[PDB]
């Protein structure tokens, strides 16, 4: 069931701290609550698109993409955030609902 989605509703989960092991032995920065009106980078298959966070409930959030993406419902997604001028992986998700262009 593949379609061209403009906005997607995702079931997500975040990492507690960023990936990596600091040489001084200090803990990696704690990944913060995904806030609305933040533009993340979403990896929806081959597609690397930007997505604006319009709302958050708990383990659910609605995202308004920057340009339309080709996916199916229940596709696995990778959430990323601009941290110290790097696209750092913050968490993952599954598309549960999505609004098409047509």
């Amino acid at each position: 069931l593949p379609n061209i989605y403009t906005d997607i509703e995702i079931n997500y989960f975040l990492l507690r701290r960023l990936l990596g092991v600091k040489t001084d032995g200090q803990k990696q920065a704690k990944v913060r609550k995904l806030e609305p009106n933040e533009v993340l980078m979403v990896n929806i298959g081959s597609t690397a698109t930007g997505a604006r966070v319009v709302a958050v409930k708990a383990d659910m959030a609605r995202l308004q993409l920057t340009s339309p993406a080709c996916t199916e419902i229940n596709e696995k997604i990778a959430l990323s955030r601009r941290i110290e001028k790097h696209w750092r992986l913050i968490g993952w998700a599954t598309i549960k609902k999505g609004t098409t262009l047509e």
């Binding site: 009106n37 933040e38 533009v39 980078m41 698109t49 920057t66 601009r82 001028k85």
Partner: protein, 272 residues
Amino acid sequence: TLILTKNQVLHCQFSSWYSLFRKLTPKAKVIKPIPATVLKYLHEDSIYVEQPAYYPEREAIQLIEKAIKELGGAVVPKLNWSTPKDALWITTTGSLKCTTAEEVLLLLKSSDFVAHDLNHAFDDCKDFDNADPKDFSFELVLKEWFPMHASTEFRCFVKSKRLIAFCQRDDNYYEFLKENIDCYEKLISDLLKKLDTFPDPDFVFDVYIHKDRAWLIDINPFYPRTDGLLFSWSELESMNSENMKPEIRLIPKASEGENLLEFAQKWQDLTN
């Protein structure tokens, strides 16, 4: 063994060379120094949009928008050197085109090239110590957008004011290039003549040929930090800066006439 210097980077700053070759490069507007609010926002982590979180002052978004509509509604943003070519995924149409101030910020904020310009500008300088950079200020460059065909873009290499080599900027094969390649070689060589006022004897200039006109796009140092593309940097070093003809490298891929035109040249080998 070639090296990078403090002034080689300074001269490559958009303002530093645009001033010199205005007539040779397509329309742009330079806001220098960059508005503090825009810089402040640029350094914040994550991309916050207004549509407890910092966003540039109404004054700045009005000034950027003023420049945009003065450049005919669409623009391509940049800082002192690097274009956000890596961030086309964040854009609404997959190009560097920017109609709104938000579109501009979105591009600059999510670009690694723009980020390099902000905290890695002098990371290879022997003359400078990256501790905290003279009478230097960051700038927001807004170039008037136009449909630019990536086929007729070339990277041109210059050692001791002589054209060393030049290559295709794209990575796709275009059959019509080998047809006009001798005329481009003339166009790009004739443009370098006009780049005599440039302060460094060794540099790399980007060019865009449209309607028998070789347009200047950028200038980057003659240092491996700047991508050598189809040429290796050790190849570019091992090259005569006193040889009359430059090396050309295009991306690799009939009639009785063609076939025997080839014979005529294959016969011309046996001779000289």
